Amino acid sequence: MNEIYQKAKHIKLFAMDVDGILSDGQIIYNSEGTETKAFYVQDGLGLQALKQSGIILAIITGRSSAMVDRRAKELGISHIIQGQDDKLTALVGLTKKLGIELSHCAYIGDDLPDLKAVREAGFGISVPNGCEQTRAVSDYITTKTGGNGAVREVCELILKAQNNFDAFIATFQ
Amino acid sequence: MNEIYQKAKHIKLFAMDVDGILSDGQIIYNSEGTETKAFYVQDGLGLQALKQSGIILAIITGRSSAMVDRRAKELGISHIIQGQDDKLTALVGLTKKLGIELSHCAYIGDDLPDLKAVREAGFGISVPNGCEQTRAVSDYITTKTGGNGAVREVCELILKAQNNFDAFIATFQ
Amino acid sequence: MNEIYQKAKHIKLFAMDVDGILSDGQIIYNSEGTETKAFYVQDGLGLQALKQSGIILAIITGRSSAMVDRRAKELGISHIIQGQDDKLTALVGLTKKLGIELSHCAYIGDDLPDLKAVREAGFGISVPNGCEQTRAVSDYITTKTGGNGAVREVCELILKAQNNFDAFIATFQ
Amino acid sequence: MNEIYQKAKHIKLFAMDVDGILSDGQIIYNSEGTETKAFYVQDGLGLQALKQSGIILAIITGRSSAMVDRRAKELGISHIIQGQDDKLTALVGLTKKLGIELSHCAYIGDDLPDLKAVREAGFGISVPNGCEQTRAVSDYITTKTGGNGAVREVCELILKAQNNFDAFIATFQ
C-alpha cells in the first residue's frame, strides 16, 4: 500500500460521488414531500484537512438536492455538479476549467455511473459495497464503508502521500 | 444457481413488496404527524436497468404512502398497488390486465402476506430477514438484505438470465 | 425452550416498553423542534396476530410522544401509558382494570425502569442490548434485537405456547 | 480495569463531545433546510444517574444545534458549549468557573479536536470508531460504540469507581 501513495502523490483535485460515498446510499422521503440525506462527521474534518493542504474538492452526483449544496458549502466543496450521471465528462470538464490534468485528479465512486471516472482518474477509489465492476477498475478500495469513514480514510491517504498528514495531526497535539 | 437463471429466463413482470424489501422494514413517524420511508440508491439503478430490458415493474404493499408513489415514479415503477395485503389476487389481477402469465411473473416479498405470491409466481424471491415460511416457499433467497441491495441483486439476476446484464454494464465501460 | 412455552401458556395481556423494544433506542430530534421515532414492520404483523388470538396489548413508556399513540392505534395497542417510569405499578394497575392476574401478564423491557415488571410478570422478557440486571431477571432473552424483530419473536412465542401460531400461518398459505 | 476506577474515583465534572459520542456521527439534513440528530435512550438514563450522584455534566461541541440544547435540557446537562472546536480551552474554562481541578474532570471524545481534552483530563475516554490518535491518548476505550451505549458504559464506570452504582441499580429492584 505504498504504491497507493505513489498514485496519490500529485493529486490536486479530489472528486466525490455522493450517494453511497458521503452517505450510506439511503434515499429518504417523507409524507409531506420532503427528502433527507445523512452524512458522517469524520468525513467532514477529513475533507477540510485535505482542502486545507491545497487540494480542491468537487461533488459529481446524478441526483439533485439542497442538502448536497448545504454539506458542500460547510466543508468547502467548491464545485458541485448535480443531476449529471456522466461523471467522466463532468470531471474532464473540471480538468479544463482549472487547468489540471486528469492524472492529477482523484475520484471516488461506488456504482456503474462512476466506473469510467474511477478507471480514468490518476487515482481511482471505490468502497466495499461499491458494485463489482467499479471496484475491479479502481486503484484503491477503502476499509471503512460509505457514510461511515470511507471518505475520511481516503482523505488521510492523500494527506499522507503528500507528506501533509502528520503535520495536520500535530495541529491537534 | 444456474437453475435460478432457468426460472428467471422468461420473466416479463417483476413485482415487489415495499417494507422490508425496498426499505429495511423501519416505519418512521414524527411528532407533527409525518411519516418517512428510506430506500437504497443501488436498488434504483437496478430497477431502471431491469425495466430498461423490457421488464415491467409493479409495487404491491399492504401499507399506503406518498413516498412509495414518489420512489415508484422516479424508477419507472408503473403499477403501484397500496393498501392491499392480498398480494396474489393483486398480482393475478395484473397478470390479466397486461396479458401476461403468472409463470412469467417474478415476485419478491419478506413476510406472511407475501407467501402465496412468492410460492405461485414463476420466480419467487425472499430475503435473509424474511419470515421463515415465505423463505421456505421461494426459489431464491438474496445475499444482500432489504433496503441494502436485495432488490439490486435480483435485478442483476434476471438481467443475467435474459442475457441482458453484461450489455448494460458495457454501457458504463 | 419448552419451559418458556409453559410460562407463556396462560398469558392474557402482553405489555411492552417502547424505546429499545419497539424501537432500536434512538431518540431523534430536528432543528424545528420535531421528534421522530422508528418502528419495525414485522413487529406490526406480530402484534396484530397476538391481539387477534385474544391477547390484549399495552404500552408502558417513561417517555411521551404522538408517534407512540400513532403506532399503537394502527396495531390495536389499546392501553397506552406514557410519561410513567414505574412500570410495575402501571402494570399492576392494568391487572386490576381488566380483572387479570399478574401471573397471566407478559412484560418485555430493556432497562432499569423495566426491571421489576420483568421480574414480577408471569412471563418476563428482555433483549440482547437490554441492561444486564433486567436481563438477569427475565424468563426469556430474544435472539432478534429491539426495533428489529424482538417483539415479533415474542409474539410468535406466545402464539405457539397457546397453540395459535401454525393456524395464523395457515391463514397465509 | 481496576486502574480505570482509580482514575474515575474523584471525578466531579463529566464533559462530552456530541457527534460520534452521544450520536453515531451522522449529520442529517433535509430539503426544507432542517437538520436532525439522533441520540440513544440508555445514554439518557446513564447521564441522569451520573448527575444524580453529584457529578456535573457538560457538552463541548464544534457544531451548533437546537437539538443539542433539547437533549441537554432533558438529561440535566447544565453547561452546553456549541460552536467551539477548542475543547481543552473550553474545558479548562469550566474548571475555573466551577472551582474544579482538571485532574477531577472526565472527558470523552472521538476525533482530533477532542485529543488534548482527552489527554489532559484526569480521566480521558474515547470510542472504538474514534480516530487513532485520540484513542492512543485516552485512559479508556469503550466497548459500546457512540450513539449506541458508549456514554452509558462510561456513566456506569464512574458510578462504580465512586461506589454509587449498585445503589442506583438497587433503586430499581
CATH code of residue D96? 3.40.50.1000
Nearest to B106 by CA among B40, B41, B153, B165: B153
In angstroms, how far is the first alpha carbon of chain D from the final one?
A: 27
Q: What is the DSSP string of chain A?
A: -HHHHHHHTT--EEEE--TTTTS-SEEEEETTS-EEEEEEHHHHHHHHHHHHTT-EEEEE-SS--HHHHHHHHHHT--EEE-S---HHHHHHHHHHHHT--GGGEEEE--SGGGHHHHHHSSEEEE-TTS-HHHHTT-SEE-SSPTTTTHHHHHHHHHHHHTT-HHHHHHTT-
Interface residue of D27, D64, D115 to substitute, partner A, most A CBs within 10 Å: D27
How far is the C-alpha of B127 from the C-alpha of B109, rounded, in Å? Answer: 8
Copy the grid coordinates of residue C12: 392474557
Residues B157, B7 contacting (CB under 8 angstroms): no
Residues C19, C64 contacting (CB under 8 angstroms): no
Q: Which of left, alpha, beta for C84 (phi over 0: left; psi -120 to 50: alpha)?
A: beta
Partner A, chain D 22-51, Cβ-Cβ below 8 Å: 25-34, 36
Count the helix, strand and coil residues of chain D and give each as a percent rounded to the nearest 5.
45, 20, 40
User: How far is CA D99 from each of CA B28, B116, C88, D7, D123, rounded to the nearest angstrom?
Assistant: 45, 70, 42, 19, 17
| CB atoms inside a 10 Å sphere around CB A6 | 11
Which single residue is written with the C-alpha cell 455522493? A18
Q: Which of left, alpha, beta for C54 (phi over 0: left; psi -120 to 50: alpha)?
A: left
| CB atoms inside a 10 Å sphere around CB B90 | 20
Amino acid at C13: L
Pairing of strands D13-16, B35-40: unpaired
Q: Kindly identify which residue of chain A lies nearest to residue B40, measuring between CA atoms.
A: A26
Residue A126 — φ and ψ, nearest 5°?
Answer: -130, -175
SS3 D6: helix
Residues C107, C94 contacting (CB under 8 angstroms): no
Copy the grid coordinates of residue A29: 422521503
Interface residue of C19, C32, C42 to substitute, partner B, most B CBs within 10 Å: C42
Amino acid at D167: A
Copy the grid coordinates of residue C80: 397506552
How far is the C-alpha of B142 from the C-alpha of B70, rounded, in Å? Answer: 25
DSSP D145: P
Q: Kindly identify which residue of chain C lies nearest to residue B38, measuring between CA atoms.
A: C38
Q: How far is C150 from chain D (nearest CA, A)?
A: 17
- Residue A28: strand pairing partners: A36, B38
Query: Is the four-CA dihedral C89, C90, C91, C96 of positive or negative sign?
Result: positive
Contacts of A131 in chain B (CB under 8 A): 42
Q: How far is D135 from chain A (nearest CA, A)?
A: 13
CA angle B19, B21, B23 (to 5 degrees): 60
Amino acid at D21: I
Which single residue is written with the C-alpha cell 437490554? C130
Q: What is the resolution of this structure in A?
A: 2.3
Residues C75, C44 contacting (CB under 8 angstroms): yes
Which single residue is written with the C-alpha cell 391463514? C171
Binary contact (B19, C36; C-beta < 8 A): no
SS3 B15: strand
Copy the grid coordinates of residue A167: 503535520
Buried b (16+ CB within 10 A) or exposed e, C119-131: bbbbbbbbbebbb
Nearest to D152 by CA among C65, C16, C143, C132: C132
Q: Kindly identify which residue of chain D lies nearest to residue A168, measuring between CA atoms.
A: D112
- With an 8 Å Cβ cutoff, is B112 touching chain C? yes
Residues D81, D95 contacting (CB under 8 angstroms): no
Pairing of strands D35-40, D26-30: antiparallel
Q: How far is B98 from chain C (nearest CA, A)?
A: 26
Copy the grid coordinates of residue B102: 403468472
Residues C156, B111 contacting (CB under 8 angstroms): no
User: How far is CA D79 from each of CA A80, C64, D95, rounded to the nearest angstrom?
Assistant: 38, 25, 12
How far is the C-alpha of C35 from the C-alpha of C69, rounded, in Å? Answer: 13
SS3 B69: helix
How far is the C-alpha of C29 from the C-alpha of D66, rounded, in Å? Answer: 9
| CB atoms inside a 10 Å sphere around CB D47 | 25
How far is the C-alpha of C58 from the C-alpha of C44, rounded, in Å? Answer: 14
Q: What is the DSSP string of C65-97?
A: -HHHHHHHHHHT--EEE-S---HHHHHHHHHHH
In angstroms, how far is the first alpha carbon of chain B from the final one?
A: 27
3-class DSSP string for A31-81 = CCCCEEEEEEHHHHHHHHHHHHCCCEEEEECCCCCHHHHHHHHHHCCCEEE
Structure determination method = X-ray
| CB atoms inside a 10 Å sphere around CB D143 | 10
Q: How far is B146 from chain A (nearest CA, A)?
A: 12
Query: Is the four-CA dihedral A60, A43, A145, D18 of positive or negative sign?
Result: negative
Nearest to C92 by CA among C64, C122, C71, C62: C122
How far is the C-alpha of D24 from the C-alpha of D46, rounded, in Å? Answer: 17
Nearest to C156 by CA among C3, C22, C54, C5: C5
Query: A touches which chains (3+ CB pairs under 8 A)?
Result: B, D
Interface residue of B26, B89, B120, B127 to substitute, partner C, most C CBs within 10 Å: B26
Residue D119, exposed/middle/buried by CB under 10 A (0-12, 13-18, 19+)?
Answer: middle
Copy the grid coordinates of residue B15: 413485482
Number of structural domains in chain A: 1
Binary contact (B32, C34; C-beta < 8 A): yes
Which single residue is written with the C-alpha cell 415487489? B16
Copy the grid coordinates of residue A21: 460515498
For C171, the domain range is: 1-173
How far is the C-alpha of C27 from the C-alpha of A46, rounded, in Å? Answer: 27
Residues C16, C125 contacting (CB under 8 angstroms): no
Amino acid at B148: N
How far is the C-alpha of A33 from the C-alpha of B164, rounded, in Å? Answer: 35
Q: Strand runs (DSSP E) across B53-162, as ranges?
A: 56-60, 79-81, 105-108, 123-126, 140-141
Sheet containing strand B123-126, edge to edge, reads: B79-81, B56-60, B13-16, B105-108, B123-126, B140-141
Residue A84 — φ and ψ, nearest 5°?
Answer: -135, 110
Q: Kindly identify which residue of chain C lies nearest to residue D26, measuring between CA atoms.
A: C28
Q: How far is B112 from chain A (nearest CA, A)?
A: 26
3-class DSSP string for D36-98 = EEEEEHHHHHHHHHHHHCCCEEEEECCCCCHHHHHHHHHHCCCEEECCCCCHHHHHHHHHHHH
How far is the C-alpha of B79 from the C-alpha of B100, rounded, in Å? Answer: 14
* Cα dihedral value D157, D160, D164, D170, nearest 10: 100
Contacts of C45 in chain B (CB under 8 A): 111-113
SS3 B77: coil
How far is the C-alpha of B48 from the C-alpha of D45, rounded, in Å? Answer: 47
Which single residue is written with the C-alpha cell 456535573? D56
Residues A100, A79 contacting (CB under 8 angstroms): no
Residues A142, A17 contacting (CB under 8 angstroms): no
Q: Kindly identify which residue of chain C lies nearest to residue B63, measuring between CA atoms.
A: C41
Residues C112, D172 contacting (CB under 8 angstroms): yes
User: How far is CA A150 from each of CA A22, A47, A56, A65, A145, rounded to the nearest angstrom?
Assistant: 8, 11, 18, 21, 5
Nearest to A50 by CA among A173, A172, A161, A170: A161
Which single residue is written with the C-alpha cell 390486465? B97
Nearest to C157 by CA among C147, C146, C168, C148: C168
| CB atoms inside a 10 Å sphere around CB C87 | 26
